[PDB]
């Protein structure tokens, strides 16, 4: 948990296929009272992020598994 | 010369008569796609042999 700072580091398209635009990882900048710690979570979760109103500056409750 | 000419001619005729594709249907499906299609793609990649799974998400256009 912590204040989120969403950012997607652009990555080359799937190397197994052609070229284009893809996202291999999604970094979330969870900031807690003790400090800050960015998490390079799986990109498939991006759907959940967009589902809820997860904007930069709110507290999110992430689950490990 | 004329020999290879007739060979290629009858080979083309045989190909035509035997043609009496799924890739073309996939390309048609692509045509029908409005264009902003996001593809969820995950493949097994190496680190049975030791390996792992990697996830990729391709975005067609910058709008999405």
């Amino acid at each position: 948990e912590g204040e989120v700072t969403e950012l997607t580091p652009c990555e080359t398209e799937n190397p197994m296929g052609g070229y284009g635009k893809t996202i291999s990882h999604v970094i979330i900048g969870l900031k807690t009272a003790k400090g800050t710690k960015q998490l390079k979570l799986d990109p498939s979760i991006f759907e959940s992020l967009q589902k809820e109103r997860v904007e930069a500056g709110d507290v999110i409750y992430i689950e490990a598994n | 010369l004329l020999r290879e000419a007739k060979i290629t001619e009858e080979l083309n005729l045989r190909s035509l008569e035997t043609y009496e594709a799924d890739k073309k249907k996939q390309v048609h499906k692509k045509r029908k796609c409005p264009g902003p299609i996001i593809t969820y793609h995950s493949v097994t990649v190496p680190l049975p042999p030791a390996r792992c799974s990697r996830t990729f998400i391709t975005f067609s256009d910058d709008a999405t």
Binding site: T12, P15, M16 | V43, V45, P46, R54
Partner: peptide, 16 residues
């Protein structure tokens, strides 16, 4: 042979 080059490129991307 093509799949071999594809997986080699995937391994190169993993190393990168």
């Amino acid at each position: 042979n093509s799949e071999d080059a594809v997986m080699t490129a995937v391994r190169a991307w993993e190393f990168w």
